[PDB]
Write a protein that binds this ligand. Sequence first.
Ligand SMILES: CN(c1ccccc1C(=O)Nc1ccc(S(=O)(=O)N2CCN(c3cccc(C(F)(F)F)c3)CC2)cc1)S(C)(=O)=O
Ligand SMILES: [Mn+2]
Ligand SMILES: [Mn+2]
Length: 230
Amino acid sequence: ATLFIADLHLCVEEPAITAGFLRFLAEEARKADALYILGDLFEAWIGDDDPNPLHRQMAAAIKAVSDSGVPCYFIHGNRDFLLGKRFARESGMTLLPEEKVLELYGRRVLIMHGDTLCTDDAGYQAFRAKVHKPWLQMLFLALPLFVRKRIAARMRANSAIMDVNQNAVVSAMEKHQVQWLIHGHTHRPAVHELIANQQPAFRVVLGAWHTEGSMVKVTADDVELIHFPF
Ligand SMILES: CN(c1ccccc1C(=O)Nc1ccc(S(=O)(=O)N2CCN(c3cccc(C(F)(F)F)c3)CC2)cc1)S(C)(=O)=O
Ligand SMILES: [Mn+2]
Ligand SMILES: [Mn+2]
């Protein structure tokens, strides 16, 4: 079975999520064929050099999973788009592109964070357009940690998540010719039915973690959205 999670928003002052993720890693993920983390693993990311002890501990925990024989893959979310190759090495994760098609037990499944589907949110898409320019990322990362942190305090006070655009959903699923899509971002967990490629299709939406978690579990038999206790 292949597992998908997203929208953990890990944060020092949300210890229930930290504990729940550590358990998931030790119990569920160790038994999987593969683990995919579809963005917003962290509440915020200002660079791989951040000395936050949470990052040390979470990297070692994820790396224990891939070091055990279970590959771990990451797609960036809007919160953690700066997570880079240094932290990918620390955590034993492979970084994926924005959109990726998997072939799982016969079935072709598109995965993404989901923010690129929220095409009606003008402010968000403008924000996203700038902060994804490599040259600008390199300048922000060159700033001192304490400056990066003050900037990030503003930007989060300043920032209710707009839901996906249906034309964007269908366009992505027809571009990749898939009948299955898994994403997060919107924090509205559900299995939706729709039409893509003039056939039945499914859009499976992960939930954010707070007092419990969610995963999608993919087997040859089934695609299941599972909501599970800490
Ligand atoms: C859907 N979200 C939004 C909606 C509208 C507008 C923005 C967002 C959004 O994701 N905001 C948001 C995302 C991440 C963060 S952060 O992790 O604290 N941090 C903030 C500092 N960032 C940064 C700022 C300028 C240039 C560059 C650079 F590029 F130079 F590195 C990077 C790096 C990321 C802070 C704010 S929401 C409601 O969750 O906040
Ligand atoms: Mn999220
Ligand atoms: Mn998001």
